[PDB]
Amino acid sequence: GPKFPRVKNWELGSITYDTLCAQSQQDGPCTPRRCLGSLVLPRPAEQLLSQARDFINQYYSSIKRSGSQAHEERLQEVEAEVASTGTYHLRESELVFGAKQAWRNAPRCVGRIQWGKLQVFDARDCSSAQEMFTYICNHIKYATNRGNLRSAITVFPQRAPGRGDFRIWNSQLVRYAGYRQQDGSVRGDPANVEITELCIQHGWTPGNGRFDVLPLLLQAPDEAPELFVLPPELVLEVPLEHPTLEWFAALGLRWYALPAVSNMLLEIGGLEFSAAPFSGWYMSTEIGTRDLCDPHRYNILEDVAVCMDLDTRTTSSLWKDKAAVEINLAVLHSFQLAKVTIVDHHAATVSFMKHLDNEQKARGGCPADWAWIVPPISGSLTPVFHQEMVNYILSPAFRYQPDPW
Amino acid sequence: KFPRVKNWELGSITYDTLCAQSQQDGPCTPRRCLGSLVLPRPPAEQLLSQARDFINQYYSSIKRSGSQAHEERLQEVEAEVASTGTYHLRESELVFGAKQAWRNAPRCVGRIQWGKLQVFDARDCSSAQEMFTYICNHIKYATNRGNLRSAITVFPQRAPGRGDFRIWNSQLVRYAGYRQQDGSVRGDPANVEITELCIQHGWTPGNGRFDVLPLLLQAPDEAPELFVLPPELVLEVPLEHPTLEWFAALGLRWYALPAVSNMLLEIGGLEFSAAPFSGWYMSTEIGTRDLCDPHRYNILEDVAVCMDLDTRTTSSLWKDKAAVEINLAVLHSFQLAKVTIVDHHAATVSFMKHLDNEQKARGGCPADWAWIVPPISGSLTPVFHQEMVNYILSPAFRYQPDPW
Numbered sequence: 001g002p003k004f005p006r007v008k009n010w011e012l013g014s015i016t017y018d019t020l021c022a023q024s025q026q027d028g029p030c031t032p033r034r035c036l037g038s039l040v041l042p043r044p045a046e047q048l049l050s051q052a053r054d055f056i057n058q059y060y061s062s063i064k065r066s067g068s069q070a071h072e073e074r075l076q077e078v079e080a081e082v083a084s085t086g087t088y089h090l091r092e093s094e095l096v097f098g099a100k101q102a103w104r105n106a107p108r109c110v111g112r113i114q115w116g117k118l119q120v121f122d123a124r125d126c127s128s129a130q131e132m133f134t135y136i137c138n139h140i141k142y143a144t145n146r147g148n149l150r151s152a153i154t155v156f157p158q159r160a161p162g163r164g165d166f167r168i169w170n171s172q173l174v175r176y177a178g179y180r181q182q183d184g185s186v187r188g189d190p191a192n193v194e195i196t197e198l199c200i201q202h203g204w205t206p207g208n209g210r211f212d213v214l215p216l217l218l219q220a221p222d223e224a225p226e227l228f229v230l231p232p233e234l235v236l237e238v239p240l241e242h243p244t245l246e247w248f249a250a251l252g253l254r255w256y257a258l259p260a261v262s263n264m265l266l267e268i269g270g271l272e273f274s275a276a277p278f279s280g281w282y283m284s285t286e287i288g289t290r291d292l293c294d295p296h297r298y299n300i301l302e303d304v305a306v307c308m309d310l311d312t313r314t315t316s317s318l319w320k321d322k323a324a325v326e327i328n329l330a331v332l333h334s335f336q337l338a339k340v341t342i343v344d345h346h347a348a349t350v351s352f353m354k355h356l357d358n359e360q361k362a363r364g365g366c367p368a369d370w371a372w373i374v375p376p377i378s379g380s381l382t383p384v385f386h387q388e389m390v391n392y393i394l395s396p397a398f399r400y401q402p403d404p405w
Numbered sequence: 406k407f408p409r410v411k412n413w414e415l416g417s418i419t420y421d422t423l424c425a426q427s428q429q430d431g432p433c434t435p436r437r438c439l440g441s442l443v444l445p446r447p448p449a450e451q452l453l454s455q456a457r458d459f460i461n462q463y464y465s466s467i468k469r470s471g472s473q474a475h476e477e478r479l480q481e482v483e484a485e486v487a488s489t490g491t492y493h494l495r496e497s498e499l500v501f502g503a504k505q506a507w508r509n510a511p512r513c514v515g516r517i518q519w520g521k522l523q524v525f526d527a528r529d530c531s532s533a534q535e536m537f538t539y540i541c542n543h544i545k546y547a548t549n550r551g552n553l554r555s556a557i558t559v560f561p562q563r564a565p566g567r568g569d570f571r572i573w574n575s576q577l578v579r580y581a582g583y584r585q586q587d588g589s590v591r592g593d594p595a596n597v598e599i600t601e602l603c604i605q606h607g608w609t610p611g612n613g614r615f616d617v618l619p620l621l622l623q624a625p626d627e628a629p630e631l632f633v634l635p636p637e638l639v640l641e642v643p644l645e646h647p648t649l650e651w652f653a654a655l656g657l658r659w660y661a662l663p664a665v666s667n668m669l670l671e672i673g674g675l676e677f678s679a680a681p682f683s684g685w686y687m688s689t690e691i692g693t694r695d696l697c698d699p700h701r702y703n704i705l706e707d708v709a710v711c712m713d714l715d716t717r718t719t720s721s722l723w724k725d726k727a728a729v730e731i732n733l734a735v736l737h738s739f740q741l742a743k744v745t746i747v748d749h750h751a752a753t754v755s756f757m758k759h760l761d762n763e764q765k766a767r768g769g770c771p772a773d774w775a776w777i778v779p780p781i782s783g784s785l786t787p788v789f790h791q792e793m794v795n796y797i798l799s800p801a802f803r804y805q806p807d808p809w
C-alpha cells in the first residue's frame with residue numbers, strides 16, 4: 001500500500017518502508033534505465049538560502065522549537081546575513097548539530113550507531129597553517145586518548161567568496177609513505193605514492209621503510225601548503241602478531257590506531273567546510289582485509305599463505321580465504337592486546353542493524369550503501385548482507401572533493 | 406549519458422553504451438537507489454515492436470541483416486500478430502533467444518559459458534505427464550555422470566486464452582523442510598511451504614534432513630500433479646573434508662545439479678512460464694549460503710564446535726574460520742566425486758574475462774554487483790574492485806509469482 005520503498009530483511013522476513021528518502025534534496029547517479037550504485041565516485045543567493053532555511057528547520061525541529069519565534073528570528077537573521085554579505089555563519093550549537101547529522105547521514109559508514117557521540121572541535125578561528133597544525137595535534141591527542149579512542153571532528157573556517165580554501169592535502173591524518181622504486185615496484189603503501197612524492201617536493205626528508213608515517217601538508221587560504229611532521233609520540237601504532245602462529249610477529253607488520261579522514265568536505269545548510277577532519281576507531285576488516293591484502297595495497301596474502309604452508313598454485317585450495325582470516329584475526333588480537341579500540345566485522349554489522357532499527361523509529365529510514373556496508377570478508381555471515389537498503393543523499397553531508405593539486 | 410566504468414584495482418576505465426538498448430525500467434531513480442532490492446515493485450503494437458526487435462537481433466546474429474529471409478520473417482510475424490494477437494518462434498530463434506537471455510542475466514557470474522547451452526524444445530508438450538518426461542531427460546542430459554552440461558528446456562508459451570504451464574518447485578532438485586512439533590525445521594527451512602504442498606497433494610513424506618522433493622507440475626487450468634524423480638537420476642555428493650576426519654560424520658550432502666524452474670523466460674514479447682535451466686554450482690552457493698545462512702541449514706556453530714573454536718565471542722572469528730573449512734569441504738568433495746564445480750576465485754576471474762569479451766562484442770555488460778560479488782572473501786576476488794552498470798535487456802529471465 002505505502003507510496004515509499006518497501007525494504008525487506010531476507011533473514012528474518014521483516015519489512016519496513018523508507019519515508020525518510022522523501023527528505024532528499026539531491027540526485028544520485030541512478031535512473032530508471034540503469035543502476036549506477038556500485039560507482040565509487042558518482043559523477044547563488046536563491047540556492048544558498050533555500051539550503052540554509054532547510055538546515056535551520058532541521059535544527060529547530062531537533063530541539064523541538066519548530067514554528068517558534070526563536071525559529072522565525074533565526075530564519076530572518078540568516079536571510080539578512082545572506083542579503084548583505086552573500087553568506088552567513090552558524091551558531092556554535094548549530095555546527096555541533098550539523099556535524100553529527102552529516103555523520104548520521106553518511107550512507108557508506110557502518111559505525112553510525114555512535115553518531116550521537118561525536119566531540120566537535122570548533123576551529124573556525126584558525127587563521128594560519130601553523131595554527132591548523134596545533135588544532136590537528138590536539139585532535140589526535142584527544143581522539144587517541146592512549147588507546148581508548150574517541151570520535152571527533154575539528155572544523156576549520158568555511159569556504160569564502162573569492163578567498164582561498166583551508167585544505168589538508170593528505171587524505172588521512174595518519175597514512176604510510178609509498179616510495180616508488182627503481183624497478184617500478186613500490187616500497188610502503190602504493191595508495192600514497194603521489195602524496196609522498198608531493199611531500200618530498202615540498203621539502204620532506206623521506207625515510208625508506210614500509211611503514212613511514214607521512215607528514216602533513218596543510219594549506220591556509222591563498223598560501224602554498226606548509227609541511228608539518230607529527231611528533232612520533234602522538235601517533236599510536238600497533239605491532240601485529242597472531243594469537244597462535246608464532247611467526248606472524250616476525251613479519252614486522254604494524255598499523256596505526258587512528259583512522260582520520262582529512263580530505264572530505266563537510267556541507268551544512270549551504271555552507272562548505274573544506275577542512276574538517278574526523279576520526280573514529282577501526283573496523284578490523286579495513287586493516288586486515290583491505291589495507292593489508294588488496295593486490296594494489298600491501299598485497300601480503302601470498303607471503304602469509306606461504307608461511308602457513310598453503311597450496312598457492314591453485315584457487316580451490318582457498319589459500320587466499322585462509323590467509324585473509326588469519327591476518328584479520330591477527331589485526332583484532334594485536335589491537336586487543338595493545339588495548340586500542342577496534343571492532344570486528346561481526347559486532348560492527350550487528351550494531352549497524354540496531355542503528356537501522358533506531359533510525360526507522362526516529363526518522364522513518366536510513367540511507368545506506370549496501371556495497372560499502374557489507375564487509376569485504378565473510379559478507380553473508382553478517383546480518384547486513386540479508387538486509388535490503390535504500391541509498392539517497394541527505395544534507396548535512398560529507399562529500400568527496402577533488403585533490404587540491 | 407554513457408556511464409564511465411572503472412576498475413579500482415587496475416585503474417582501467419571503459420564506457421557502457423550497451424545500456425542505451427534497455428527498453429525496461431529498473432527500480433532506481435535520481436532521488437534514491439534501490440539496486441540492493443531482491444524483487445522490486447499485450448496490445449498488438451507493443452508485442453509487434455518487441456517481436457521485430459528480437460527478429461532484428463537474430464538476423465544480425467547470423468549476419469543476414471537485411472536479407473530476404475529477414476524480410477519474410479518480419480512479414481510472417483506481423484501477419485501472425487495482426488490476425489491472432491500473437492505468434493510463434495522458429496526453433497533456431499528459440500535457441501538464440503535462450504542463450505541471449507542467459508547472456509543478459511545481470512545476477513549471473515557464470516556468463517562466460519553463455520554460448521554453450523543445450524536447448525530442448527518442449528513446446529509440443531500437452532500434459533503434466535509429458536512435462537515430467539522432459540524434465541527427466543533434461544536432468545539425465547545435464548547431469549551426464551558428473552560431467553555437467555548447461556541446459557534449458559522450454560515449455561509452451563503463455564496464451565491469452567488460458568492458464569500457464571508451471572513448475573511449482575523453485576528448483577528441479579531441492580530438499581524437503583518439515584516443520585516440527587517444537588517449532589524447529591528438519592531439512593531445508595527454505596522449502597517448508599513447497600514441502601507442505603507436496604504432502605497436501607498426496608506425497609508420502611520422508612523424515613531426514615536431505616529428502617529430495619517430488620515435482621509438482623501444472624498443465625493449463627489443471628490442478629498440479631505430483632511426480633517422484635527416480636533416485637538414480639538425482640546425483641548427490643557426500644561431503645567430507647580433506648584433513649578433518651570428523652567432518653564426514655556430520656552426514657552432510659548436496660546435489661550436483663542447480664536447476665532453476667520457477668523463472669519466466671521472455672523472448673521477443675513471448676513469455677515462457679515454464680523453462681527450467683541448469684549449469685553447475687559455484688561452491689559458495691552450497692558452502693556459504695545453503696549450509697551457513699542462519700535461515701537455512703545453519704551449520705556454522707556445529708562445525709566451529711567440532712573444530713574446538715571459541716564460540717563465546719565474535720572476535721575469535723570462529724564464523725569466518727568454519728565457513729572457509731565448509732567451503733573447502735564442498736570443493737574437495739565435488740572434486741573427489743568427479744562432479745563439475747567452480748570455486749569463487751576461478752568463477753570471478755572468468756567473469757572478468759567475460760566483461761572484457763562483452764565490452765568488445767557489445768560495448769557493455771549489465772551486471773548486478775551485489776550478486777556478482779561472492780558471499781565470502783568479496784574483496785579477495787577481482788569483481789569486488791570492478792564498477793558495474795545494471796540494467797534490463799531482452800531476451801530475459803524474470804521473476805514470477807508462485808502459482809498458488
Ligand code: HEM
Pocket residue numbers: 103106108109110111112114118151152153278279280281282283286343348372398
Ligand atoms: C566510531 C567508529 C567508526 C567506525 C567503526 C566507522 C566505520 C566505517 C567504515 C568501515 C567505513 C568504510 C571505510 C572504507 O572501506 O574505506 C566508513 C566510512 C565512512 N565513515 Fe565511518 N566509522 C566510524 C566513525 C566515523 C565518524 C566519527 C565519522 C564522521 C564523523 C564517520 C564518517 C564516515 C564517512 C563520511 C564515510 C565514507 C567515507 C568515504 O566515502 O570515503 N565514521 N566508516
Ligand code: HEM
Pocket residue numbers: 503507510512513514515516518522555556557682683684685686687690747752776802
Ligand atoms: C554454467 C555454470 C553456471 C554457474 C557457475 C552459474 C553461477 C551463478 C550464480 C553463483 C548465481 C547466483 C546464485 C544465487 O546467489 O542464488 C547465478 C544466478 C543466475 N544464473 Fe547462472 N550460473 C551458471 C549457469 C547458468 C545458466 C545455464 C543459466 C540460464 C541458461 C543461468 C542463469 C542465471 C540466472 C537467470 C540467475 C539469476 C537467478 C535469480 O535471480 O534467482 N546460469 N548463476
Ligand SMILES: Cc1cc(N)nc(CCc2cncc(CCc3cc(C)nc(N)c3)c2)c1
Pocket residue numbers: 040041259260261278279280281282283286400
Ligand atoms: C572516521 C573513519 C573511521 C573508520 N573506521 N574508517 C574510516 C574510513 C577511512 C578511509 C580509509 N581508506 C580509504 C577510504 C576511502 C577514501 C575514498 C576514496 C574515494 C576515491 N572516494 C571516496 N568517497 C572515499 C576511507 C573513517
Ligand SMILES: Cc1cc(N)nc(CCc2cncc(CCc3cc(C)nc(N)c3)c2)c1
Pocket residue numbers: 443444576663664665682683684685686687690804
Ligand atoms: C543455473 C544456475 C547455476 C548455478 N550455479 N546456480 C544457480 C542458482 C540457483 C538458485 C538457488 N537458490 C536460490 C536462488 C535464488 C532464488 C530466488 C529467490 C527469490 C525470492 N528471488 C530471486 N530472484 C531468486 C537461485 C543457478
Ligand SMILES: C[C@H](O)[C@H](O)[C@H]1CNc2nc(N)[nH]c(=O)c2N1
Pocket residue numbers: 038039040371372373413789790791792793
Ligand atoms: C567497485 C566497488 O564499488 C568498490 O570496490 C567499493 C565496493 N565496496 C567498498 N566498501 C567499502 N567499505 N570500502 C570500499 O573501498 C569499497 N569499494
Ligand SMILES: C[C@H](O)[C@H](O)[C@H]1CNc2nc(N)[nH]c(=O)c2N1
Pocket residue numbers: 010385386387388389441442443775776777
Ligand atoms: C539484500 C541483498 O541484496 C540480498 O541478500 C542478496 C545480496 N547478494 C546476493 N548474491 C547472490 N549471489 N545471491 C543472493 O541470494 C544474494 N542476496
Ligand SMILES: [Zn+2]
Pocket residue numbers: 030031034035036037433434437438439440
Ligand atoms: Zn541504483
